[PDB]
From a paper:
Here, we describe variants with all combinations of the aliphatic residues, Ile, Leu and Val, at a and d to give four classes of peptide: the ββ class, with a and d = Ile or Val; Lβ, a = Leu and d = Ile or Val; βL, a = Ile or Val and d = Leu; and LL, a = d = Leu. Peptides are named systematically appending the one-letter code for the amino acids at the a and d sites to “CC-Type2-“; e.g., CC-Hept becomes CC-Type2-LI.
As a = d = β-branched specify blunt-ended α-helical barrels, we explored all four combinations of Ile and Val at these sites. CC-Type2-VV, -IV, -VI and -II, were helical and bound DPH in solution consistent with α-helical barrels. Interestingly, X-ray crystallography revealed that oligomer state increased through this series: CC-Type2-VV was hexameric; CC-Type2-IV, heptameric; and CC-Type2-II, octameric. The latter extends the range of discrete water-soluble α-helical barrels presented to date; though we note that the solution-phase and solid-state oligomers states do not match for this particular peptide. Inspection of the models for these alternative states exposed steric clashes associated with the β-branched residues; e.g., threading of the CC-Type2-II sequence onto the CC-Type2-LL-Sg structure resulted in irreconcilable clashes between Cδ and Cγ1 atoms of Ile residues at a and d’ sites of neighbouring helices. More specifically, by disfavouring alternative states, potential steric clashes involving β-branched Ile residues at a and d appear critical for maintaining parallel α-helical-barrels structures.
Author numbering:
A (entry chain B), B (entry chain A), C (entry chain B), D (entry chain A), E (entry chain B), F (entry chain A), ...: 1 to 30
Write the structure that this text describes.
Amino acid sequence: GEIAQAIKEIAKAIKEIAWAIKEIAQAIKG
Amino acid sequence: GEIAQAIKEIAKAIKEIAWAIKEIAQAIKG
Amino acid sequence: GEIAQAIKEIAKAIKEIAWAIKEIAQAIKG
Amino acid sequence: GEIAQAIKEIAKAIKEIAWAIKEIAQAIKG
Amino acid sequence: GEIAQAIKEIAKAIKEIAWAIKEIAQAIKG
Amino acid sequence: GEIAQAIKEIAKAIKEIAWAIKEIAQAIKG
Amino acid sequence: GEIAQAIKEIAKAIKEIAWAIKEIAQAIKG
Amino acid sequence: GEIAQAIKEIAKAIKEIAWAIKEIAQAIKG
């Protein structure tokens, strides 16, 4: 359904934020 | 539907936050 | 509809957060 | 409606977070 | 209604986050 | 209702994030 | 109900974020 | 149901953000 799919698009975007935060950890450590 | 589309607009905005955090990571690496 | 519009208002606010985070990247880089 | 209005209250609060992040950006620039 | 009130409780919590972020700006500036 | 109560649980968790950010502010001030 | 339980899973995840932010306060203070 | 499952996908993504923040904490401690 379109609303479940839209909700899933939110979850994928949140995963992008987690990845970006991971990059900041790499930046600090380096 | 309008609700599903508005939920997608939230997902797009959340992606924009991910891109901005990536910019912070790169600014730290530099 | 009023609920779709309210949801869209959330997406616009999230976009404001992304912009502010972009500013922090500029601040760090400078 | 009360639900749409409560959702708008969330959007206003999310804007307040954007303003606060802008203050961090300016504090770094200073 | 109970669901609108619960949603409003979310908005108030988000406002608490904005205030805390404001404190971080004060901390940095000081 | 169970849905309203679960939404309140999210609001309580969001408050916990505010408290944690306040701890960062105080750690910076110190 | 499954939707209330899913919402509760969101609240527990948000609590994990609060805990992680608490760790950052400890890291800064130390 | 598909909606409950999509909401769970959001919770999993939010956990991923917690793990990433923990990495920042450890990078600071190091």
